[PDB]
């Protein structure tokens, strides 16, 4: 039944600077070296950690305890494992002697060369820092695996002008070998992934406004659909609720598309933020979701599917939780708040988990 | 004799994305909460690690071994300790009960609020990623400690246009409370630090050329001078040797200034890159130093000081070493190559160490 393997490289919303948003995707079970990244925060560094670290598992927290039981953060039915998947690792183990002789750094370069394509949601630095700093790895060899960075224009235009511009970073897109490329996607259009037999469908969403400019700051939701099984996952960039009159109902458009085109049984997971707990703090919430806003969005999706079973069976994987100087880990607070609000709103057998770095989900 | 405490938050040259360049400075022994940062790669995340991790000490490597003895990377006379200094930690311990009640995350916010001023060498993303992602922490409170980002114009203009621009990052400099400010420094001019009784003297250096534009890419060397003791440290941005005819001898200007104005006995350390080992690889070396180029620069400084004792007693702390898919840790290769070349060039009792994240130097 499992179609997707999702490696959580980074699920941190800030303001600490490591492990920011990046998810690796591949088909379940298969052993090709090729990998897709959604966003570009945590990258090589995190792959290396997972190659070393790989039960009463404890995960980092730094609140009530420095480490906490893994099960506290996840739905009890979630198919999750620590480390990289057996099949991802098998692409290194295709050569017996070579795998054993290769040190951790070498293994990291090898796995990382397989990242063919990034789908970037928006160009905020926390979503691109690993993509950028890791990028010179592409020049380690003559016979070279090339990388492509995909996005809607609001992302690609910014990367071209403000990142790969010989000021913030050497303009690797200008190098004649074209080992790093920027490519635009059209919104709402079914586009094809390059290696996997998957469709990718990007949708624009709102993510606040400029501090100086007041201009809308856009983000992206990506649908990945396995063509054979028709199973899908939704992987989201940072997002806030739409404003009734002053703007386009981008989220309504998105949920309507999902309900029309993807039966709930085929929706294997949504990776979506809840940056903040219910406790106000407007400065930290701008451009983001809190549990009431996320539950309101899921309630809208529920209304569109229009089943008496609610969202029963749906896996919601909560990403981009921010640190806060609070007594309790906000991931735990948010998880409890979301579960409470889902129960209050009668959303059915909805399965809510927090995304945990250094783990793979099987959906 | 020790005047400076230098906390190494990040000394990684890339392409792995965590622990990139950032050094914290404070006067030795004193317990004020205020701190200076040079560069802005590793930040809050690394402070938090150091608050938790704090003998046969092993440090991360990931080559021949995943962890290696600390002493392999340093000169035997180097005054170094793991973790934050006792006096830095004392600023938290001024309140007994409060310190004990505060969790690791809270302690991290508290220490980090003390970073008053950043001195940025150049705006490449690896030198600013932590500064940027950490910056919203400034809005955690009403009665707020404010931060200032200092640099030469080649840095500040780029940060204004390409980073704090509501596209790559919210433009926090436009927020009316002015809790984050960008300020320019004049090159070669003795300027004053805001809290510590220190002079700061910035010098422009070369750091390669644009891939697309061919334009010179500049960097900065910072001299910090304690006015009472007259002791100085030099903390460097990324740099390459000058080209004889085609450009200004920026490095010659710098070493000449040092030899004229700072007696060797007062020069307590230089933190300077050696990104690459002697083994060629032009693509990785562009804009950077290898051991022959670094030793040539130190030889030039030696000639200017003009002593038969060479650079005896000088601490050279090597930063920004890049990963490479090699059998041996390049920090070890580089250390051996530098020591060999220094001996061959008769530079005297020069003390060479690699900068190690998660440690404090006392110079
Ligand atoms: Zn974000
Ligand atoms: Zn964002
Ligand atoms: Zn650098
Ligand atoms: Zn640089």
Swiss-Prot record, chains A, B:
Query: Which family is it part of?
Result: Belongs to the cyclic nucleotide phosphodiesterase class-II family.
Lineage of the native species?
Answer: Eukaryota, Fungi, Dikarya, Ascomycota, Saccharomycotina
The record's section on SUPFAM superfamilies has:
Metallo-hydrolase/oxidoreductase
Q: Which gene encodes it?
A: PDE1
Could you share any additional remarks the record makes about this protein? Present with 1400 molecules/cell in log phase SD medium.
Instruction: Report the function annotation for this chain.
Output: Controls the level of cAMP in yeast cells, together with the high-affinity cAMP phosphodiesterase (PDE2).
Originating species: Saccharomyces cerevisiae (strain ATCC 204508 / S288c) (Baker's yeast)
Keywords assigned by UniProt?
cAMP, Hydrolase
Q: What is this protein called?
A: 3',5'-cyclic-nucleotide phosphodiesterase 1
InterPro entries listed in its UniProt record: cAMP-PdiesteraseII_CS, Pdiesterase2, RibonucZ/Hydroxyglut_hydro
